Every structure is written in structure tokens, then in C-alpha cells.
Amino acid sequence: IEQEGVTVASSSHFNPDPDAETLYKAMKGIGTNEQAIIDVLTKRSNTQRQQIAKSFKAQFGKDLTETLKSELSGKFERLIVALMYPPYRYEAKELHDAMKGLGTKEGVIIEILASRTKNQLREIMKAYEEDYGSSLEEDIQADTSGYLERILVCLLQGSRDDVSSFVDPALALQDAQDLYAAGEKIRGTDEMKFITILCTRSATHLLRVFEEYEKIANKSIEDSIKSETHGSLEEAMLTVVKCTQNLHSYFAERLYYAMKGAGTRDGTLIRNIVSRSEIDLNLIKCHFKKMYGKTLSSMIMEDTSGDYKNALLSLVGSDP
């Protein structure tokens, strides 16, 4: 389970018992030692933490996550619980939460379905079904509509990483040609062609289309997108583009906008820090600095507070 909260490097040989004991000492009795919880959980890998849960259950008779949900509050709680989830159940849960409440958090569904590989998505899908009873595709279908649903359902189908990934240039020039044909037709009548190309072609193929399109039309693919669609479908198409050009830049941007301007978008902040933790958080950090001047942690230092603040900082790690 290498998808939340790594140490600094990858790991090995490990007695989980002492850590399970510190967590116990920290929550036992009157008053809670939040620093100990931070020092264990944000400095062990997802796998290590899963093993700490097991020692914890056998040594003391209670489930670690439920004790966590029970002892802690606010963002701090949401963050620490988020850390405890296995890599695929975590996204499944966020996906479920998006649809379980009042309104759909479309941003959440877009972010996950578009940023994951076919095989990651496969795992999420199976994790969803086992934990929640129903099919993820059907829930998406019953909870969204229009062309948003079609791109979403297609993004579920699987061929972003199922395709051969070496570029056919006669097909790549056909695609940009088609997209470019759309511009002289009325906005709305071509949206199905955009979806098909954006969701059935590979990333390497797509990069080529973007190059041909720019050669052909004098405008970027981001502009042609804004000219043919609006709203959430636009957000979905723009997302797929950004994830194709630079997946690490997309996340950096998702993180910036969680904190940009007035207020904070904590759910966005948590999901991205936690889930990219043991994949590419060190690259996102690099892209974040380069794109916005300030470091991620520097922005964390100003927009968040308390034990929640310090856990993020410990999670993010040395941000030079």
C-alpha cells in the first residue's frame, strides 16, 4: 500500500508493535497527545500504517481508524483518517462521498477519473463495489447527465493506457483535422467527436494531435475546447489535456487553487497530498515552486492552522 504518506524513501523490515503502542498511550485516558499521532502516522508508509492498525487491533481490541474518528475532530481528523485508507479504497471513498451527499462534487469525479491510469481505475472500481454495494459506473450514470456523463463513462471504460502508445501519424493528422473542422460548425454539434478523441486515444497519440492542431489552426487545443463547450464538460476536457501534457503540473495547479485567494478548499488539499504522497509529491513540490514562486509548505503555513497545519507540513516533508 504505497499511495499515502511515505517516510522520505521506500521501506523494509518492520516491528509494528511499538508504534501501535504509542498511538495507544496517545489516546488512552483524559486528553490526547496529537504530536505523537503526527509523529507516527505522517512518518510511516501506507503499508507500515496498515500493519500498525493490525498490531493495534490485536493488542488493544479496538479498530485504529474508529478510535481515530472518535478521538479527533475537524480537518485534522479528515487528514489522519485519509492517511489510514489503503491506496485504492481511498479514491473509491472520495468518489462515493462526492455522490452520497447533497449535490454532486463533479470536480472530485473529474479529478480522479481523468488523473488515473486504466489499472488504477480498475482497482478503484473493484474497491468501490466491495465497500459500497453498487457499481461505480451506474452511480455516475444515475447521478450525472448530458455529455459530462459520456466522457465520465468513457473514461471508466479504459483506453488511456490500454492503447498501443506508438503514434500513427495518419490517424493523428486525421484527428486534428476533425477537431479543426469543428471550428467552422456551430458550438455544440461536435462535442461527441471531442470526447471520443480525448478519451479513446493514448497519451502519446494525443500529444501529437495537439501539435498538429496548433500547426493547422494557430490556436492551442485549450482555446478550441473553450470555443466548443462550457461548464463541467469544459472542465473535464481541459483536465484530460493537462493530465496528458504534464500530470505533475496538473496536481500543482490543483493544489494552488485549493488555497488561492479567499478561503481554503481542504478536501482538495488533503486528497491530493495524501494520494500522491508515495508516487510523485516530490515532483509536484518542484513544479509548484517553479510555477508560483512560493513553496507549497509556505502556502500551507499561511492558509491552515493547528495540528492540521503541522501534519500537512510533516507529510509534505523538507520543502527547500
PDB file of C-alpha atoms in Angstrom:
ATOM      1  CA  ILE A   1       0.000   0.000   0.000  1.00  0.00           C
ATOM      2  CA  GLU A   2       2.331   2.731  -1.369  1.00  0.00           C
ATOM      3  CA  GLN A   3      -0.065   5.581  -2.057  1.00  0.00           C
ATOM      4  CA  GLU A   4      -0.145   7.655   1.171  1.00  0.00           C
ATOM      5  CA  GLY A   5       2.352   9.346   3.499  1.00  0.00           C
ATOM      6  CA  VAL A   6       5.831   7.922   2.827  1.00  0.00           C
ATOM      7  CA  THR A   7       8.826   8.494   5.158  1.00  0.00           C
ATOM      8  CA  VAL A   8      11.382  10.073   2.795  1.00  0.00           C
ATOM      9  CA  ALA A   9      12.409   6.918   0.851  1.00  0.00           C
ATOM     10  CA  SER A  10      10.996   3.372   0.302  1.00  0.00           C
ATOM     11  CA  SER A  11      10.925   0.875   3.227  1.00  0.00           C
ATOM     12  CA  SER A  12      11.623  -2.625   4.739  1.00  0.00           C
ATOM     13  CA  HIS A  13      11.878  -4.877   7.926  1.00  0.00           C
ATOM     14  CA  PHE A  14       9.464  -3.554  10.495  1.00  0.00           C
ATOM     15  CA  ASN A  15       8.135  -4.241  14.003  1.00  0.00           C
ATOM     16  CA  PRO A  16       4.668  -2.598  14.043  1.00  0.00           C
ATOM     17  CA  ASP A  17       4.083  -3.196  17.780  1.00  0.00           C
ATOM     18  CA  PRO A  18       5.916  -0.177  19.366  1.00  0.00           C
ATOM     19  CA  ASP A  19       4.124   2.333  17.101  1.00  0.00           C
ATOM     20  CA  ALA A  20       0.730   0.758  17.846  1.00  0.00           C
ATOM     21  CA  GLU A  21       1.633   1.216  21.485  1.00  0.00           C
ATOM     22  CA  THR A  22       2.495   4.919  21.195  1.00  0.00           C
ATOM     23  CA  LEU A  23      -0.857   5.596  19.495  1.00  0.00           C
ATOM     24  CA  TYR A  24      -2.496   3.820  22.446  1.00  0.00           C
ATOM     25  CA  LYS A  25      -0.564   5.873  25.006  1.00  0.00           C
ATOM     26  CA  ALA A  26      -1.529   8.999  23.000  1.00  0.00           C
ATOM     27  CA  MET A  27      -5.264   8.328  23.039  1.00  0.00           C
ATOM     28  CA  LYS A  28      -5.518   6.496  26.378  1.00  0.00           C
ATOM     29  CA  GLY A  29      -7.317   8.383  29.143  1.00  0.00           C
ATOM     30  CA  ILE A  30      -8.100  12.054  29.623  1.00  0.00           C
ATOM     31  CA  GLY A  31      -6.600  14.332  26.986  1.00  0.00           C
ATOM     32  CA  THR A  32      -4.959  13.381  23.707  1.00  0.00           C
ATOM     33  CA  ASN A  33      -1.346  13.793  22.613  1.00  0.00           C
ATOM     34  CA  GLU A  34      -1.730  14.968  18.976  1.00  0.00           C
ATOM     35  CA  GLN A  35       2.075  15.247  18.365  1.00  0.00           C
ATOM     36  CA  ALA A  36       2.683  11.592  18.935  1.00  0.00           C
ATOM     37  CA  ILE A  37      -0.098  10.765  16.431  1.00  0.00           C
ATOM     38  CA  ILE A  38       1.503  13.053  13.899  1.00  0.00           C
ATOM     39  CA  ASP A  39       4.986  11.627  14.514  1.00  0.00           C
ATOM     40  CA  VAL A  40       3.972   8.059  13.921  1.00  0.00           C
ATOM     41  CA  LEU A  41       1.378   8.367  11.158  1.00  0.00           C
ATOM     42  CA  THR A  42       2.985  11.002   8.904  1.00  0.00           C
ATOM     43  CA  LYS A  43       6.399   9.250   9.137  1.00  0.00           C
ATOM     44  CA  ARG A  44       5.345   5.735   8.222  1.00  0.00           C
ATOM     45  CA  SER A  45       4.316   4.471   4.769  1.00  0.00           C
ATOM     46  CA  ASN A  46       0.702   3.428   3.924  1.00  0.00           C
ATOM     47  CA  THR A  47       1.796  -0.286   4.176  1.00  0.00           C
ATOM     48  CA  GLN A  48       3.512   0.278   7.514  1.00  0.00           C
ATOM     49  CA  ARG A  49       0.395   2.069   8.786  1.00  0.00           C
ATOM     50  CA  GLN A  50      -1.802  -0.845   7.715  1.00  0.00           C
ATOM     51  CA  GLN A  51       0.422  -3.080   9.796  1.00  0.00           C
ATOM     52  CA  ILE A  52       0.227  -0.681  12.748  1.00  0.00           C
ATOM     53  CA  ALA A  53      -3.583  -0.963  12.550  1.00  0.00           C
ATOM     54  CA  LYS A  54      -3.355  -4.775  12.869  1.00  0.00           C
ATOM     55  CA  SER A  55      -0.982  -4.762  15.857  1.00  0.00           C
ATOM     56  CA  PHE A  56      -3.244  -2.073  17.372  1.00  0.00           C
ATOM     57  CA  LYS A  57      -6.425  -4.172  16.945  1.00  0.00           C
ATOM     58  CA  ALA A  58      -4.875  -7.344  18.470  1.00  0.00           C
ATOM     59  CA  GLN A  59      -3.034  -5.616  21.288  1.00  0.00           C
ATOM     60  CA  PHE A  60      -5.991  -3.497  22.485  1.00  0.00           C
ATOM     61  CA  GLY A  61      -9.212  -4.818  20.996  1.00  0.00           C
ATOM     62  CA  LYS A  62     -10.317  -1.709  19.088  1.00  0.00           C
ATOM     63  CA  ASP A  63     -10.064  -0.718  15.411  1.00  0.00           C
ATOM     64  CA  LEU A  64      -7.447   2.114  14.989  1.00  0.00           C
ATOM     65  CA  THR A  65      -9.443   4.104  12.396  1.00  0.00           C
ATOM     66  CA  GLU A  66     -12.653   4.141  14.520  1.00  0.00           C
ATOM     67  CA  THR A  67     -10.694   5.266  17.568  1.00  0.00           C
ATOM     68  CA  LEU A  68      -9.160   7.949  15.332  1.00  0.00           C
ATOM     69  CA  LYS A  69     -12.581   9.099  14.049  1.00  0.00           C
ATOM     70  CA  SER A  70     -13.772   9.015  17.646  1.00  0.00           C
ATOM     71  CA  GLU A  71     -10.846  10.897  19.321  1.00  0.00           C
ATOM     72  CA  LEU A  72     -10.106  13.646  16.768  1.00  0.00           C
ATOM     73  CA  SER A  73     -12.041  16.485  15.099  1.00  0.00           C
ATOM     74  CA  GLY A  74     -12.077  18.867  12.160  1.00  0.00           C
ATOM     75  CA  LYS A  75      -9.667  18.925   9.223  1.00  0.00           C
ATOM     76  CA  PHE A  76      -7.029  17.237  11.416  1.00  0.00           C
ATOM     77  CA  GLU A  77      -9.321  14.237  11.734  1.00  0.00           C
ATOM     78  CA  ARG A  78     -10.176  14.120   7.997  1.00  0.00           C
ATOM     79  CA  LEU A  79      -6.444  14.187   7.213  1.00  0.00           C
ATOM     80  CA  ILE A  80      -5.378  11.465   9.663  1.00  0.00           C
ATOM     81  CA  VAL A  81      -8.292   9.173   8.655  1.00  0.00           C
ATOM     82  CA  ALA A  82      -7.401   9.841   4.996  1.00  0.00           C
ATOM     83  CA  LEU A  83      -3.899   8.541   5.747  1.00  0.00           C
ATOM     84  CA  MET A  84      -5.243   5.222   7.045  1.00  0.00           C
ATOM     85  CA  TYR A  85      -7.009   4.185   3.842  1.00  0.00           C
ATOM     86  CA  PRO A  86      -5.358   1.695   1.508  1.00  0.00           C
ATOM     87  CA  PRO A  87      -4.401   3.203  -1.864  1.00  0.00           C
ATOM     88  CA  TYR A  88      -7.479   2.157  -3.761  1.00  0.00           C
ATOM     89  CA  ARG A  89     -10.279   2.250  -1.265  1.00  0.00           C
ATOM     90  CA  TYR A  90      -9.241   5.860  -0.570  1.00  0.00           C
ATOM     91  CA  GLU A  91     -10.217   7.154  -4.045  1.00  0.00           C
ATOM     92  CA  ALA A  92     -13.334   4.922  -4.002  1.00  0.00           C
ATOM     93  CA  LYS A  93     -14.352   6.630  -0.778  1.00  0.00           C
ATOM     94  CA  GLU A  94     -13.790  10.172  -2.082  1.00  0.00           C
ATOM     95  CA  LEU A  95     -15.788   9.139  -5.178  1.00  0.00           C
ATOM     96  CA  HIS A  96     -18.619   7.808  -3.012  1.00  0.00           C
ATOM     97  CA  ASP A  97     -18.622  10.974  -0.832  1.00  0.00           C
ATOM     98  CA  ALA A  98     -18.974  13.089  -3.964  1.00  0.00           C
ATOM     99  CA  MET A  99     -22.342  11.440  -4.717  1.00  0.00           C
ATOM    100  CA  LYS A 100     -23.573  10.421  -1.226  1.00  0.00           C
ATOM    101  CA  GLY A 101     -24.479  13.915  -0.057  1.00  0.00           C
ATOM    102  CA  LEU A 102     -26.459  16.990  -1.124  1.00  0.00           C
ATOM    103  CA  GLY A 103     -25.202  17.753  -4.638  1.00  0.00           C
ATOM    104  CA  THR A 104     -22.524  16.119  -6.730  1.00  0.00           C
ATOM    105  CA  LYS A 105     -18.937  17.215  -6.259  1.00  0.00           C
ATOM    106  CA  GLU A 106     -18.279  16.970 -10.018  1.00  0.00           C
ATOM    107  CA  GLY A 107     -14.793  18.426  -9.570  1.00  0.00           C
ATOM    108  CA  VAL A 108     -13.854  15.383  -7.465  1.00  0.00           C
ATOM    109  CA  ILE A 109     -15.103  12.844 -10.024  1.00  0.00           C
ATOM    110  CA  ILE A 110     -13.468  14.694 -12.859  1.00  0.00           C
ATOM    111  CA  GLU A 111     -10.127  14.984 -10.956  1.00  0.00           C
ATOM    112  CA  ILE A 112      -9.908  11.243 -10.132  1.00  0.00           C
ATOM    113  CA  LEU A 113     -11.282   9.657 -13.338  1.00  0.00           C
ATOM    114  CA  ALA A 114      -9.043  11.837 -15.513  1.00  0.00           C
ATOM    115  CA  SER A 115      -5.781  11.643 -13.480  1.00  0.00           C
ATOM    116  CA  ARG A 116      -5.636   7.834 -13.011  1.00  0.00           C
ATOM    117  CA  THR A 117      -4.294   5.050 -15.227  1.00  0.00           C
ATOM    118  CA  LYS A 118      -6.537   2.319 -16.589  1.00  0.00           C
ATOM    119  CA  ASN A 119      -5.224  -0.112 -13.978  1.00  0.00           C
ATOM    120  CA  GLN A 120      -5.518   2.342 -11.064  1.00  0.00           C
ATOM    121  CA  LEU A 121      -9.123   2.930 -12.136  1.00  0.00           C
ATOM    122  CA  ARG A 122      -9.708  -0.818 -12.314  1.00  0.00           C
ATOM    123  CA  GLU A 123      -8.604  -1.055  -8.669  1.00  0.00           C
ATOM    124  CA  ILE A 124     -10.787   1.904  -7.604  1.00  0.00           C
ATOM    125  CA  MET A 125     -13.752   0.266  -9.364  1.00  0.00           C
ATOM    126  CA  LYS A 126     -13.308  -3.007  -7.509  1.00  0.00           C
ATOM    127  CA  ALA A 127     -12.675  -1.158  -4.212  1.00  0.00           C
ATOM    128  CA  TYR A 128     -15.873   0.825  -4.791  1.00  0.00           C
ATOM    129  CA  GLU A 129     -18.068  -2.231  -5.403  1.00  0.00           C
ATOM    130  CA  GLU A 130     -16.812  -4.123  -2.335  1.00  0.00           C
ATOM    131  CA  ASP A 131     -17.148  -1.225   0.065  1.00  0.00           C
ATOM    132  CA  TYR A 132     -20.330   0.418  -1.141  1.00  0.00           C
ATOM    133  CA  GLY A 133     -22.539  -2.313  -2.613  1.00  0.00           C
ATOM    134  CA  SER A 134     -23.259  -0.782  -6.023  1.00  0.00           C
ATOM    135  CA  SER A 135     -21.388  -0.271  -9.328  1.00  0.00           C
ATOM    136  CA  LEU A 136     -19.380   2.958  -9.776  1.00  0.00           C
ATOM    137  CA  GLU A 137     -20.353   3.311 -13.448  1.00  0.00           C
ATOM    138  CA  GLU A 138     -24.110   3.038 -12.679  1.00  0.00           C
ATOM    139  CA  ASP A 139     -23.939   5.588  -9.844  1.00  0.00           C
ATOM    140  CA  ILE A 140     -22.104   8.003 -12.187  1.00  0.00           C
ATOM    141  CA  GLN A 141     -24.820   7.297 -14.782  1.00  0.00           C
ATOM    142  CA  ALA A 142     -27.762   7.895 -12.428  1.00  0.00           C
ATOM    143  CA  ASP A 143     -26.094  10.961 -10.789  1.00  0.00           C
ATOM    144  CA  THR A 144     -24.783  12.867 -13.813  1.00  0.00           C
ATOM    145  CA  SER A 145     -26.130  13.501 -17.299  1.00  0.00           C
ATOM    146  CA  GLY A 146     -25.544  15.277 -20.598  1.00  0.00           C
ATOM    147  CA  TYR A 147     -22.162  14.934 -22.256  1.00  0.00           C
ATOM    148  CA  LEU A 148     -20.404  15.050 -18.839  1.00  0.00           C
ATOM    149  CA  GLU A 149     -21.734  11.563 -18.219  1.00  0.00           C
ATOM    150  CA  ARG A 150     -20.499  10.265 -21.554  1.00  0.00           C
ATOM    151  CA  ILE A 151     -16.895  11.439 -21.049  1.00  0.00           C
ATOM    152  CA  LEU A 152     -17.052  10.123 -17.494  1.00  0.00           C
ATOM    153  CA  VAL A 153     -18.408   6.694 -18.518  1.00  0.00           C
ATOM    154  CA  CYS A 154     -15.882   6.548 -21.359  1.00  0.00           C
ATOM    155  CA  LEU A 155     -13.031   7.481 -19.028  1.00  0.00           C
ATOM    156  CA  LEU A 156     -14.159   4.465 -16.955  1.00  0.00           C
ATOM    157  CA  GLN A 157     -14.192   2.069 -19.959  1.00  0.00           C
ATOM    158  CA  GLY A 158     -10.382   2.017 -20.124  1.00  0.00           C
ATOM    159  CA  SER A 159      -8.164   3.053 -23.044  1.00  0.00           C
ATOM    160  CA  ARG A 160      -5.768   5.764 -21.865  1.00  0.00           C
ATOM    161  CA  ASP A 161      -3.183   3.018 -21.111  1.00  0.00           C
ATOM    162  CA  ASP A 162      -4.806   0.066 -22.979  1.00  0.00           C
ATOM    163  CA  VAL A 163      -3.883   1.514 -26.387  1.00  0.00           C
ATOM    164  CA  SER A 164      -0.567   0.632 -28.120  1.00  0.00           C
ATOM    165  CA  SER A 165       1.030   4.026 -27.350  1.00  0.00           C
ATOM    166  CA  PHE A 166       3.090   4.287 -30.544  1.00  0.00           C
ATOM    167  CA  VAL A 167       1.812   7.040 -32.779  1.00  0.00           C
ATOM    168  CA  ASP A 168       0.036   6.541 -36.072  1.00  0.00           C
ATOM    169  CA  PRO A 169       0.632   9.920 -37.816  1.00  0.00           C
ATOM    170  CA  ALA A 170      -2.063   9.427 -40.500  1.00  0.00           C
ATOM    171  CA  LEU A 171      -4.601   8.934 -37.725  1.00  0.00           C
ATOM    172  CA  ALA A 172      -3.023  11.733 -35.626  1.00  0.00           C
ATOM    173  CA  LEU A 173      -3.399  14.165 -38.529  1.00  0.00           C
ATOM    174  CA  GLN A 174      -6.963  12.954 -39.208  1.00  0.00           C
ATOM    175  CA  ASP A 175      -7.878  13.754 -35.571  1.00  0.00           C
ATOM    176  CA  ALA A 176      -6.514  17.314 -35.627  1.00  0.00           C
ATOM    177  CA  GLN A 177      -8.178  17.755 -38.999  1.00  0.00           C
ATOM    178  CA  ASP A 178     -11.509  16.674 -37.459  1.00  0.00           C
ATOM    179  CA  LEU A 179     -11.121  18.914 -34.422  1.00  0.00           C
ATOM    180  CA  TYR A 180     -10.213  21.755 -36.766  1.00  0.00           C
ATOM    181  CA  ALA A 181     -13.268  21.037 -38.924  1.00  0.00           C
ATOM    182  CA  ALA A 182     -15.436  21.599 -35.817  1.00  0.00           C
ATOM    183  CA  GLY A 183     -14.497  25.286 -35.526  1.00  0.00           C
ATOM    184  CA  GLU A 184     -16.474  26.207 -38.650  1.00  0.00           C
ATOM    185  CA  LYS A 185     -19.575  24.428 -37.317  1.00  0.00           C
ATOM    186  CA  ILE A 186     -21.903  25.722 -34.597  1.00  0.00           C
ATOM    187  CA  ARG A 187     -20.721  25.133 -30.997  1.00  0.00           C
ATOM    188  CA  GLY A 188     -22.396  22.016 -29.549  1.00  0.00           C
ATOM    189  CA  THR A 189     -22.811  19.814 -32.639  1.00  0.00           C
ATOM    190  CA  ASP A 190     -19.252  18.415 -32.413  1.00  0.00           C
ATOM    191  CA  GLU A 191     -18.921  17.652 -28.729  1.00  0.00           C
ATOM    192  CA  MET A 192     -19.125  13.894 -29.313  1.00  0.00           C
ATOM    193  CA  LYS A 193     -16.071  13.968 -31.619  1.00  0.00           C
ATOM    194  CA  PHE A 194     -14.043  15.827 -28.932  1.00  0.00           C
ATOM    195  CA  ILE A 195     -14.939  13.219 -26.290  1.00  0.00           C
ATOM    196  CA  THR A 196     -14.034  10.194 -28.478  1.00  0.00           C
ATOM    197  CA  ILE A 197     -10.597  11.553 -29.431  1.00  0.00           C
ATOM    198  CA  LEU A 198      -9.875  12.817 -25.892  1.00  0.00           C
ATOM    199  CA  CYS A 199     -10.868   9.569 -24.175  1.00  0.00           C
ATOM    200  CA  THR A 200     -10.137   6.704 -26.660  1.00  0.00           C
ATOM    201  CA  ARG A 201      -6.685   7.758 -27.916  1.00  0.00           C
ATOM    202  CA  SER A 202      -3.474   7.236 -25.968  1.00  0.00           C
ATOM    203  CA  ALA A 203      -1.479  10.000 -24.261  1.00  0.00           C
ATOM    204  CA  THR A 204       1.435   9.768 -26.741  1.00  0.00           C
ATOM    205  CA  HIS A 205      -1.034   9.886 -29.634  1.00  0.00           C
ATOM    206  CA  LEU A 206      -2.907  12.819 -28.060  1.00  0.00           C
ATOM    207  CA  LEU A 207       0.333  14.833 -27.656  1.00  0.00           C
ATOM    208  CA  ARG A 208       0.873  14.527 -31.417  1.00  0.00           C
ATOM    209  CA  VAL A 209      -2.734  15.676 -32.198  1.00  0.00           C
ATOM    210  CA  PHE A 210      -2.138  18.806 -30.056  1.00  0.00           C
ATOM    211  CA  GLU A 211       0.950  19.531 -32.119  1.00  0.00           C
ATOM    212  CA  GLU A 212      -0.849  19.014 -35.475  1.00  0.00           C
ATOM    213  CA  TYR A 213      -3.813  21.111 -34.314  1.00  0.00           C
ATOM    214  CA  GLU A 214      -1.593  24.045 -33.390  1.00  0.00           C
ATOM    215  CA  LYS A 215       0.218  23.789 -36.754  1.00  0.00           C
ATOM    216  CA  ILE A 216      -3.133  23.728 -38.518  1.00  0.00           C
ATOM    217  CA  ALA A 217      -5.271  26.315 -36.695  1.00  0.00           C
ATOM    218  CA  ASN A 218      -2.971  28.842 -34.976  1.00  0.00           C
ATOM    219  CA  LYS A 219      -4.788  28.278 -31.691  1.00  0.00           C
ATOM    220  CA  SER A 220      -3.992  25.850 -28.866  1.00  0.00           C
ATOM    221  CA  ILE A 221      -6.172  22.890 -28.006  1.00  0.00           C
ATOM    222  CA  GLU A 222      -7.204  24.701 -24.772  1.00  0.00           C
ATOM    223  CA  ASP A 223      -8.770  27.530 -26.833  1.00  0.00           C
ATOM    224  CA  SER A 224     -10.668  25.258 -29.214  1.00  0.00           C
ATOM    225  CA  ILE A 225     -12.039  23.475 -26.138  1.00  0.00           C
ATOM    226  CA  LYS A 226     -13.338  26.775 -24.653  1.00  0.00           C
ATOM    227  CA  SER A 227     -14.949  27.564 -28.011  1.00  0.00           C
ATOM    228  CA  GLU A 228     -16.914  24.318 -28.371  1.00  0.00           C
ATOM    229  CA  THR A 229     -18.138  23.617 -24.795  1.00  0.00           C
ATOM    230  CA  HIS A 230     -18.918  25.210 -21.428  1.00  0.00           C
ATOM    231  CA  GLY A 231     -19.231  24.380 -17.733  1.00  0.00           C
ATOM    232  CA  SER A 232     -18.367  20.984 -16.349  1.00  0.00           C
ATOM    233  CA  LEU A 233     -17.739  19.369 -19.734  1.00  0.00           C
ATOM    234  CA  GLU A 234     -15.177  22.098 -20.408  1.00  0.00           C
ATOM    235  CA  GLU A 235     -13.570  21.427 -17.018  1.00  0.00           C
ATOM    236  CA  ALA A 236     -13.436  17.711 -17.903  1.00  0.00           C
ATOM    237  CA  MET A 237     -11.820  18.233 -21.317  1.00  0.00           C
ATOM    238  CA  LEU A 238      -9.323  20.803 -20.047  1.00  0.00           C
ATOM    239  CA  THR A 239      -8.434  18.351 -17.282  1.00  0.00           C
ATOM    240  CA  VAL A 240      -7.715  15.482 -19.678  1.00  0.00           C
ATOM    241  CA  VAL A 241      -5.493  17.841 -21.694  1.00  0.00           C
ATOM    242  CA  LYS A 242      -3.475  18.982 -18.629  1.00  0.00           C
ATOM    243  CA  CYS A 243      -3.030  15.453 -17.358  1.00  0.00           C
ATOM    244  CA  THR A 244      -1.683  14.469 -20.815  1.00  0.00           C
ATOM    245  CA  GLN A 245       0.842  17.307 -21.127  1.00  0.00           C
ATOM    246  CA  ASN A 246       2.086  17.268 -17.550  1.00  0.00           C
ATOM    247  CA  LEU A 247       0.395  15.220 -14.843  1.00  0.00           C
ATOM    248  CA  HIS A 248       2.657  16.744 -12.155  1.00  0.00           C
ATOM    249  CA  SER A 249       1.769  20.240 -13.227  1.00  0.00           C
ATOM    250  CA  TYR A 250      -1.951  19.472 -13.083  1.00  0.00           C
ATOM    251  CA  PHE A 251      -1.638  18.470  -9.412  1.00  0.00           C
ATOM    252  CA  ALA A 252       0.488  21.500  -8.548  1.00  0.00           C
ATOM    253  CA  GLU A 253      -2.285  23.587 -10.058  1.00  0.00           C
ATOM    254  CA  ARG A 254      -4.987  21.655  -8.237  1.00  0.00           C
ATOM    255  CA  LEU A 255      -3.091  22.368  -5.019  1.00  0.00           C
ATOM    256  CA  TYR A 256      -2.582  26.092  -5.709  1.00  0.00           C
ATOM    257  CA  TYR A 257      -6.296  26.653  -6.394  1.00  0.00           C
ATOM    258  CA  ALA A 258      -7.243  24.834  -3.188  1.00  0.00           C
ATOM    259  CA  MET A 259      -5.514  27.692  -1.373  1.00  0.00           C
ATOM    260  CA  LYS A 260      -5.655  30.564  -3.907  1.00  0.00           C
ATOM    261  CA  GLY A 261      -7.443  33.785  -2.956  1.00  0.00           C
ATOM    262  CA  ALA A 262     -10.186  33.843  -0.310  1.00  0.00           C
ATOM    263  CA  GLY A 263     -10.835  30.709   1.854  1.00  0.00           C
ATOM    264  CA  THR A 264      -9.410  27.173   1.611  1.00  0.00           C
ATOM    265  CA  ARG A 265     -10.508  24.036  -0.246  1.00  0.00           C
ATOM    266  CA  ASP A 266      -9.345  21.488   2.318  1.00  0.00           C
ATOM    267  CA  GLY A 267     -10.851  18.357   0.762  1.00  0.00           C
ATOM    268  CA  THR A 268      -8.906  19.090  -2.439  1.00  0.00           C
ATOM    269  CA  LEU A 269      -5.751  19.819  -0.481  1.00  0.00           C
ATOM    270  CA  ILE A 270      -5.998  16.588   1.547  1.00  0.00           C
ATOM    271  CA  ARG A 271      -6.939  14.240  -1.262  1.00  0.00           C
ATOM    272  CA  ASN A 272      -4.014  15.346  -3.385  1.00  0.00           C
ATOM    273  CA  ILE A 273      -1.281  15.494  -0.731  1.00  0.00           C
ATOM    274  CA  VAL A 274      -2.382  12.143   0.716  1.00  0.00           C
ATOM    275  CA  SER A 275      -2.940  10.184  -2.520  1.00  0.00           C
ATOM    276  CA  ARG A 276       0.211  11.331  -4.404  1.00  0.00           C
ATOM    277  CA  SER A 277       2.370  11.001  -1.276  1.00  0.00           C
ATOM    278  CA  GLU A 278       4.268   7.861  -2.288  1.00  0.00           C
ATOM    279  CA  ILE A 279       4.154   8.373  -6.012  1.00  0.00           C
ATOM    280  CA  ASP A 280       5.190  11.883  -7.046  1.00  0.00           C
ATOM    281  CA  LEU A 281       4.713  14.500  -4.271  1.00  0.00           C
ATOM    282  CA  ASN A 282       8.439  15.411  -4.601  1.00  0.00           C
ATOM    283  CA  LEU A 283       7.834  16.309  -8.292  1.00  0.00           C
ATOM    284  CA  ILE A 284       4.639  18.235  -7.604  1.00  0.00           C
ATOM    285  CA  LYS A 285       6.568  20.253  -4.985  1.00  0.00           C
ATOM    286  CA  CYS A 286       9.187  21.080  -7.626  1.00  0.00           C
ATOM    287  CA  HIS A 287       6.566  22.130 -10.185  1.00  0.00           C
ATOM    288  CA  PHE A 288       4.656  24.131  -7.578  1.00  0.00           C
ATOM    289  CA  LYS A 289       7.665  26.287  -6.638  1.00  0.00           C
ATOM    290  CA  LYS A 290       8.649  26.856 -10.278  1.00  0.00           C
ATOM    291  CA  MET A 291       5.085  27.878 -11.248  1.00  0.00           C
ATOM    292  CA  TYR A 292       4.091  30.139  -8.292  1.00  0.00           C
ATOM    293  CA  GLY A 293       7.325  31.436  -6.711  1.00  0.00           C
ATOM    294  CA  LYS A 294       6.350  30.274  -3.208  1.00  0.00           C
ATOM    295  CA  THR A 295       6.783  26.744  -1.883  1.00  0.00           C
ATOM    296  CA  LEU A 296       3.774  24.528  -1.157  1.00  0.00           C
ATOM    297  CA  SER A 297       4.604  24.416   2.564  1.00  0.00           C
ATOM    298  CA  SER A 298       4.967  28.186   2.670  1.00  0.00           C
ATOM    299  CA  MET A 299       1.384  28.490   1.408  1.00  0.00           C
ATOM    300  CA  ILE A 300       0.331  25.725   3.861  1.00  0.00           C
ATOM    301  CA  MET A 301       1.913  27.834   6.648  1.00  0.00           C
ATOM    302  CA  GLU A 302      -0.436  30.734   5.998  1.00  0.00           C
ATOM    303  CA  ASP A 303      -3.740  29.173   4.969  1.00  0.00           C
ATOM    304  CA  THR A 304      -4.073  26.435   7.603  1.00  0.00           C
ATOM    305  CA  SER A 305      -3.722  26.129  11.363  1.00  0.00           C
ATOM    306  CA  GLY A 306      -3.331  23.928  14.482  1.00  0.00           C
ATOM    307  CA  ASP A 307      -2.474  20.212  14.440  1.00  0.00           C
ATOM    308  CA  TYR A 308      -3.873  20.028  10.909  1.00  0.00           C
ATOM    309  CA  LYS A 309      -1.176  22.527   9.777  1.00  0.00           C
ATOM    310  CA  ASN A 310       1.698  20.570  11.329  1.00  0.00           C
ATOM    311  CA  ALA A 311       0.550  17.228   9.970  1.00  0.00           C
ATOM    312  CA  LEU A 312       0.492  18.579   6.413  1.00  0.00           C
ATOM    313  CA  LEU A 313       3.998  20.013   6.969  1.00  0.00           C
ATOM    314  CA  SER A 314       5.276  16.704   8.332  1.00  0.00           C
ATOM    315  CA  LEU A 315       3.621  14.909   5.368  1.00  0.00           C
ATOM    316  CA  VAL A 316       4.978  17.291   2.741  1.00  0.00           C
ATOM    317  CA  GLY A 317       8.439  16.999   4.333  1.00  0.00           C
ATOM    318  CA  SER A 318      11.543  19.095   3.563  1.00  0.00           C
ATOM    319  CA  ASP A 319      10.301  21.706   1.112  1.00  0.00           C
ATOM    320  CA  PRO A 320      13.550  23.550   0.264  1.00  0.00           C
TER     321      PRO A 320
END
